[PDB]
Amino acid sequence: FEDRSYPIDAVFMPVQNANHSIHSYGNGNEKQEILFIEIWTNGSLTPKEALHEA
Amino acid sequence: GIQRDDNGRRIWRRRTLTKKDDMLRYKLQRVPFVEEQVRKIKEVGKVMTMDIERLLLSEDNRFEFVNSVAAEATEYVEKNRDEYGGTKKAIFHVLSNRVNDLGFDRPEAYAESDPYKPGPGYLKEYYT
């Protein structure tokens, strides 16, 4: 509250957006599904680095 | 308007906008989060819907367009019977060729597959 300093309402979101999707496959009784993950970052982190950190 | 600067080079006035257009700054901006949307559009085949609408912008009668496309597809099938019916469809090939004839690059007959199929025998189960 001191020294008349103006705050900055920072939003700590290095990952701008993220999504996941599922693809399913199967031939009879045996099934299998695949996970896809999309990562958008603001350059302070690569999507691979974001994946590992998460 | 002719003027040479004593060395054989001709100096001329470049044409410039020299004015303010507010529509330039506000319109040349790109949305950053449409990768999945574009990929899904390509996967489901809406680019072909856009192509079909584009082809009809130059047709006075749409029934004539349909008849001509059907005739061209019939010629395609008669000339090379074995190449169509599976992954390549004659009508899709005709549409892609008519789009390509305008100078717009398209995959042949809009034929695409899934690179993530886990080997032979596995069929994708659609999630309704």
PDB file of C-alpha atoms in Angstrom:
ATOM      1  CA  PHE A   1       0.000   0.000   0.000  1.00  0.00           C
ATOM      2  CA  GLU A   2       3.035   2.286   0.389  1.00  0.00           C
ATOM      3  CA  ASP A   3       5.129   4.550  -1.885  1.00  0.00           C
ATOM      4  CA  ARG A   4       2.289   5.038  -4.421  1.00  0.00           C
ATOM      5  CA  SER A   5       3.131   2.091  -6.675  1.00  0.00           C
ATOM      6  CA  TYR A   6       0.621   1.148  -9.358  1.00  0.00           C
ATOM      7  CA  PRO A   7      -0.208  -2.582  -9.441  1.00  0.00           C
ATOM      8  CA  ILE A   8      -0.306  -4.596 -12.652  1.00  0.00           C
ATOM      9  CA  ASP A   9      -3.023  -7.261 -12.785  1.00  0.00           C
ATOM     10  CA  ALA A  10      -0.804  -9.955 -14.259  1.00  0.00           C
ATOM     11  CA  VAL A  11      -2.307 -13.229 -15.484  1.00  0.00           C
ATOM     12  CA  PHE A  12       0.310 -15.983 -15.157  1.00  0.00           C
ATOM     13  CA  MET A  13      -0.640 -17.999 -18.245  1.00  0.00           C
ATOM     14  CA  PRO A  14       2.471 -19.036 -20.191  1.00  0.00           C
ATOM     15  CA  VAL A  15       0.274 -21.635 -21.915  1.00  0.00           C
ATOM     16  CA  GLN A  16      -2.276 -19.571 -23.837  1.00  0.00           C
ATOM     17  CA  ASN A  17      -4.566 -22.499 -24.666  1.00  0.00           C
ATOM     18  CA  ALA A  18      -4.711 -26.285 -24.489  1.00  0.00           C
ATOM     19  CA  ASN A  19      -6.962 -28.973 -25.961  1.00  0.00           C
ATOM     20  CA  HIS A  20      -7.199 -32.755 -26.045  1.00  0.00           C
ATOM     21  CA  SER A  21      -8.958 -35.168 -28.383  1.00  0.00           C
ATOM     22  CA  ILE A  22      -9.445 -38.928 -28.600  1.00  0.00           C
ATOM     23  CA  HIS A  23      -9.330 -41.271 -31.598  1.00  0.00           C
ATOM     24  CA  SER A  24     -10.656 -44.795 -31.047  1.00  0.00           C
ATOM     25  CA  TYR A  25      -9.883 -47.910 -33.091  1.00  0.00           C
ATOM     26  CA  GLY A  26     -10.790 -51.570 -32.862  1.00  0.00           C
ATOM     27  CA  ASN A  27     -11.227 -54.904 -34.662  1.00  0.00           C
ATOM     28  CA  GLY A  28     -13.670 -57.004 -32.652  1.00  0.00           C
ATOM     29  CA  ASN A  29     -13.032 -57.570 -28.956  1.00  0.00           C
ATOM     30  CA  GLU A  30      -9.742 -55.624 -28.753  1.00  0.00           C
ATOM     31  CA  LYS A  31      -9.900 -51.826 -28.739  1.00  0.00           C
ATOM     32  CA  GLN A  32      -7.345 -49.026 -28.723  1.00  0.00           C
ATOM     33  CA  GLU A  33      -7.506 -45.247 -28.402  1.00  0.00           C
ATOM     34  CA  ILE A  34      -5.107 -42.394 -29.119  1.00  0.00           C
ATOM     35  CA  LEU A  35      -4.633 -39.143 -27.201  1.00  0.00           C
ATOM     36  CA  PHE A  36      -3.860 -35.854 -28.965  1.00  0.00           C
ATOM     37  CA  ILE A  37      -2.778 -32.769 -27.009  1.00  0.00           C
ATOM     38  CA  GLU A  38      -2.512 -29.256 -28.449  1.00  0.00           C
ATOM     39  CA  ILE A  39      -0.497 -26.613 -26.600  1.00  0.00           C
ATOM     40  CA  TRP A  40      -0.249 -22.894 -27.380  1.00  0.00           C
ATOM     41  CA  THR A  41       2.451 -20.959 -25.523  1.00  0.00           C
ATOM     42  CA  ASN A  42       3.503 -17.305 -25.507  1.00  0.00           C
ATOM     43  CA  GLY A  43       7.116 -18.131 -26.396  1.00  0.00           C
ATOM     44  CA  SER A  44       8.388 -18.224 -22.805  1.00  0.00           C
ATOM     45  CA  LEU A  45       8.185 -22.024 -23.087  1.00  0.00           C
ATOM     46  CA  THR A  46       8.001 -24.533 -25.882  1.00  0.00           C
ATOM     47  CA  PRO A  47       4.965 -26.835 -26.143  1.00  0.00           C
ATOM     48  CA  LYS A  48       7.263 -29.797 -25.468  1.00  0.00           C
ATOM     49  CA  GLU A  49       8.630 -28.056 -22.370  1.00  0.00           C
ATOM     50  CA  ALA A  50       5.059 -27.274 -21.309  1.00  0.00           C
ATOM     51  CA  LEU A  51       4.082 -30.933 -21.747  1.00  0.00           C
ATOM     52  CA  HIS A  52       7.031 -32.117 -19.654  1.00  0.00           C
ATOM     53  CA  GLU A  53       6.433 -29.502 -16.952  1.00  0.00           C
ATOM     54  CA  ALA A  54       2.742 -30.404 -16.733  1.00  0.00           C
TER      55      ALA A  54
ATOM     56  CA  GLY B   1       8.707  13.279 -66.540  1.00  0.00           C
ATOM     57  CA  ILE B   2      11.931  12.031 -68.106  1.00  0.00           C
ATOM     58  CA  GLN B   3      15.126  12.888 -66.227  1.00  0.00           C
ATOM     59  CA  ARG B   4      18.553  11.227 -66.280  1.00  0.00           C
ATOM     60  CA  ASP B   5      21.049  11.934 -63.496  1.00  0.00           C
ATOM     61  CA  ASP B   6      24.061  12.409 -65.812  1.00  0.00           C
ATOM     62  CA  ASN B   7      25.185   8.753 -65.504  1.00  0.00           C
ATOM     63  CA  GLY B   8      22.728   7.010 -67.841  1.00  0.00           C
ATOM     64  CA  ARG B   9      20.332   6.137 -65.014  1.00  0.00           C
ATOM     65  CA  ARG B  10      16.795   7.500 -65.316  1.00  0.00           C
ATOM     66  CA  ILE B  11      15.383   8.941 -62.088  1.00  0.00           C
ATOM     67  CA  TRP B  12      11.621   8.594 -61.686  1.00  0.00           C
ATOM     68  CA  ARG B  13       9.065   9.350 -58.992  1.00  0.00           C
ATOM     69  CA  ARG B  14       7.840   6.377 -56.977  1.00  0.00           C
ATOM     70  CA  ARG B  15       4.089   6.189 -56.387  1.00  0.00           C
ATOM     71  CA  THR B  16       3.047   6.058 -52.729  1.00  0.00           C
ATOM     72  CA  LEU B  17      -0.188   5.925 -50.759  1.00  0.00           C
ATOM     73  CA  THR B  18       0.522   9.354 -49.152  1.00  0.00           C
ATOM     74  CA  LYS B  19      -2.776   9.039 -47.260  1.00  0.00           C
ATOM     75  CA  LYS B  20      -4.318   7.325 -44.241  1.00  0.00           C
ATOM     76  CA  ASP B  21      -6.444   4.188 -44.651  1.00  0.00           C
ATOM     77  CA  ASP B  22      -7.780   3.033 -41.284  1.00  0.00           C
ATOM     78  CA  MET B  23      -8.889  -0.275 -42.837  1.00  0.00           C
ATOM     79  CA  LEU B  24      -5.269  -1.439 -43.177  1.00  0.00           C
ATOM     80  CA  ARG B  25      -4.285  -1.617 -39.502  1.00  0.00           C
ATOM     81  CA  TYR B  26      -7.620  -3.052 -38.336  1.00  0.00           C
ATOM     82  CA  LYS B  27      -7.944  -5.844 -40.926  1.00  0.00           C
ATOM     83  CA  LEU B  28      -4.506  -7.457 -41.404  1.00  0.00           C
ATOM     84  CA  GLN B  29      -4.580  -9.463 -38.178  1.00  0.00           C
ATOM     85  CA  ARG B  30      -4.524 -13.238 -37.730  1.00  0.00           C
ATOM     86  CA  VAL B  31      -6.332 -15.418 -35.195  1.00  0.00           C
ATOM     87  CA  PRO B  32      -3.805 -17.700 -33.469  1.00  0.00           C
ATOM     88  CA  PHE B  33      -5.887 -20.626 -32.193  1.00  0.00           C
ATOM     89  CA  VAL B  34      -7.569 -22.236 -35.214  1.00  0.00           C
ATOM     90  CA  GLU B  35      -5.140 -25.117 -35.850  1.00  0.00           C
ATOM     91  CA  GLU B  36      -7.587 -27.774 -34.654  1.00  0.00           C
ATOM     92  CA  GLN B  37     -10.450 -26.038 -36.464  1.00  0.00           C
ATOM     93  CA  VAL B  38      -8.594 -25.951 -39.794  1.00  0.00           C
ATOM     94  CA  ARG B  39      -7.466 -29.555 -39.352  1.00  0.00           C
ATOM     95  CA  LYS B  40     -11.022 -30.692 -38.606  1.00  0.00           C
ATOM     96  CA  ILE B  41     -12.358 -28.758 -41.611  1.00  0.00           C
ATOM     97  CA  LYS B  42      -9.830 -30.522 -43.831  1.00  0.00           C
ATOM     98  CA  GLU B  43     -10.634 -33.895 -42.241  1.00  0.00           C
ATOM     99  CA  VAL B  44     -14.403 -33.659 -42.697  1.00  0.00           C
ATOM    100  CA  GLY B  45     -14.252 -32.171 -46.198  1.00  0.00           C
ATOM    101  CA  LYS B  46     -15.700 -28.664 -46.060  1.00  0.00           C
ATOM    102  CA  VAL B  47     -13.030 -27.358 -48.433  1.00  0.00           C
ATOM    103  CA  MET B  48     -14.897 -29.306 -51.106  1.00  0.00           C
ATOM    104  CA  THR B  49     -18.092 -27.468 -50.144  1.00  0.00           C
ATOM    105  CA  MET B  50     -16.246 -24.174 -50.596  1.00  0.00           C
ATOM    106  CA  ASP B  51     -14.906 -25.414 -53.944  1.00  0.00           C
ATOM    107  CA  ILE B  52     -18.398 -26.432 -55.082  1.00  0.00           C
ATOM    108  CA  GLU B  53     -19.741 -22.991 -54.197  1.00  0.00           C
ATOM    109  CA  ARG B  54     -16.803 -21.365 -56.005  1.00  0.00           C
ATOM    110  CA  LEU B  55     -17.383 -23.375 -59.191  1.00  0.00           C
ATOM    111  CA  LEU B  56     -21.038 -22.292 -59.286  1.00  0.00           C
ATOM    112  CA  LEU B  57     -20.135 -18.586 -59.161  1.00  0.00           C
ATOM    113  CA  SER B  58     -19.198 -18.888 -62.857  1.00  0.00           C
ATOM    114  CA  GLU B  59     -22.218 -20.961 -63.960  1.00  0.00           C
ATOM    115  CA  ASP B  60     -25.380 -19.350 -65.302  1.00  0.00           C
ATOM    116  CA  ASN B  61     -27.367 -22.560 -64.737  1.00  0.00           C
ATOM    117  CA  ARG B  62     -26.582 -25.034 -61.962  1.00  0.00           C
ATOM    118  CA  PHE B  63     -28.375 -27.941 -63.649  1.00  0.00           C
ATOM    119  CA  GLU B  64     -26.050 -27.547 -66.633  1.00  0.00           C
ATOM    120  CA  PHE B  65     -23.126 -27.583 -64.194  1.00  0.00           C
ATOM    121  CA  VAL B  66     -24.357 -30.845 -62.669  1.00  0.00           C
ATOM    122  CA  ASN B  67     -24.868 -32.406 -66.102  1.00  0.00           C
ATOM    123  CA  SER B  68     -21.390 -31.373 -67.272  1.00  0.00           C
ATOM    124  CA  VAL B  69     -19.776 -32.718 -64.093  1.00  0.00           C
ATOM    125  CA  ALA B  70     -21.635 -36.013 -64.494  1.00  0.00           C
ATOM    126  CA  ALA B  71     -20.570 -36.284 -68.145  1.00  0.00           C
ATOM    127  CA  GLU B  72     -16.926 -35.592 -67.275  1.00  0.00           C
ATOM    128  CA  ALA B  73     -17.047 -38.175 -64.473  1.00  0.00           C
ATOM    129  CA  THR B  74     -18.557 -40.692 -66.896  1.00  0.00           C
ATOM    130  CA  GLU B  75     -15.699 -40.052 -69.325  1.00  0.00           C
ATOM    131  CA  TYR B  76     -13.203 -40.509 -66.478  1.00  0.00           C
ATOM    132  CA  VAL B  77     -14.740 -43.843 -65.496  1.00  0.00           C
ATOM    133  CA  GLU B  78     -14.971 -45.109 -69.078  1.00  0.00           C
ATOM    134  CA  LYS B  79     -11.347 -44.265 -69.882  1.00  0.00           C
ATOM    135  CA  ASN B  80      -9.841 -45.628 -66.622  1.00  0.00           C
ATOM    136  CA  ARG B  81     -12.362 -47.903 -64.915  1.00  0.00           C
ATOM    137  CA  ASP B  82     -10.049 -49.515 -62.364  1.00  0.00           C
ATOM    138  CA  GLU B  83      -8.764 -46.265 -60.847  1.00  0.00           C
ATOM    139  CA  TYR B  84     -12.124 -45.242 -59.344  1.00  0.00           C
ATOM    140  CA  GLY B  85     -14.642 -46.626 -56.883  1.00  0.00           C
ATOM    141  CA  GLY B  86     -12.291 -46.982 -53.923  1.00  0.00           C
ATOM    142  CA  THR B  87     -10.128 -44.237 -52.463  1.00  0.00           C
ATOM    143  CA  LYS B  88     -10.595 -42.187 -55.657  1.00  0.00           C
ATOM    144  CA  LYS B  89     -14.103 -41.123 -56.683  1.00  0.00           C
ATOM    145  CA  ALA B  90     -14.732 -39.876 -60.211  1.00  0.00           C
ATOM    146  CA  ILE B  91     -16.950 -36.934 -59.243  1.00  0.00           C
ATOM    147  CA  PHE B  92     -14.451 -35.793 -56.614  1.00  0.00           C
ATOM    148  CA  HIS B  93     -11.682 -36.082 -59.208  1.00  0.00           C
ATOM    149  CA  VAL B  94     -13.709 -33.945 -61.631  1.00  0.00           C
ATOM    150  CA  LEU B  95     -14.313 -31.329 -58.940  1.00  0.00           C
ATOM    151  CA  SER B  96     -10.640 -31.219 -57.938  1.00  0.00           C
ATOM    152  CA  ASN B  97      -9.546 -30.929 -61.575  1.00  0.00           C
ATOM    153  CA  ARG B  98     -12.002 -28.096 -62.215  1.00  0.00           C
ATOM    154  CA  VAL B  99     -10.685 -26.325 -59.122  1.00  0.00           C
ATOM    155  CA  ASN B 100      -7.087 -27.021 -60.180  1.00  0.00           C
ATOM    156  CA  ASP B 101      -7.799 -25.702 -63.691  1.00  0.00           C
ATOM    157  CA  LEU B 102      -8.332 -22.283 -62.078  1.00  0.00           C
ATOM    158  CA  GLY B 103      -4.809 -22.424 -60.640  1.00  0.00           C
ATOM    159  CA  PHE B 104      -5.821 -23.395 -57.090  1.00  0.00           C
ATOM    160  CA  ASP B 105      -3.916 -26.386 -55.738  1.00  0.00           C
ATOM    161  CA  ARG B 106      -6.008 -29.212 -54.278  1.00  0.00           C
ATOM    162  CA  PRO B 107      -5.316 -32.840 -53.357  1.00  0.00           C
ATOM    163  CA  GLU B 108      -6.363 -35.208 -56.115  1.00  0.00           C
ATOM    164  CA  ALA B 109     -10.050 -36.165 -55.778  1.00  0.00           C
ATOM    165  CA  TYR B 110      -9.921 -34.968 -52.143  1.00  0.00           C
ATOM    166  CA  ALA B 111      -8.520 -38.396 -51.267  1.00  0.00           C
ATOM    167  CA  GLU B 112      -7.210 -38.492 -47.695  1.00  0.00           C
ATOM    168  CA  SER B 113      -6.504 -41.225 -45.153  1.00  0.00           C
ATOM    169  CA  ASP B 114      -5.664 -41.425 -41.455  1.00  0.00           C
ATOM    170  CA  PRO B 115      -1.916 -41.594 -40.702  1.00  0.00           C
ATOM    171  CA  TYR B 116      -2.672 -42.739 -37.137  1.00  0.00           C
ATOM    172  CA  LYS B 117      -4.363 -46.050 -37.952  1.00  0.00           C
ATOM    173  CA  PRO B 118      -2.654 -48.618 -35.660  1.00  0.00           C
ATOM    174  CA  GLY B 119      -1.790 -51.108 -38.381  1.00  0.00           C
ATOM    175  CA  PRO B 120      -3.984 -53.218 -40.644  1.00  0.00           C
ATOM    176  CA  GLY B 121      -7.355 -54.460 -39.475  1.00  0.00           C
ATOM    177  CA  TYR B 122      -8.114 -51.590 -37.079  1.00  0.00           C
ATOM    178  CA  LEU B 123     -11.189 -49.534 -37.991  1.00  0.00           C
ATOM    179  CA  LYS B 124     -11.887 -46.130 -36.471  1.00  0.00           C
ATOM    180  CA  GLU B 125     -14.956 -46.190 -34.223  1.00  0.00           C
ATOM    181  CA  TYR B 126     -16.861 -42.945 -34.687  1.00  0.00           C
ATOM    182  CA  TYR B 127     -17.966 -41.114 -31.536  1.00  0.00           C
ATOM    183  CA  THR B 128     -21.560 -40.043 -32.200  1.00  0.00           C
TER     184      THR B 128
END
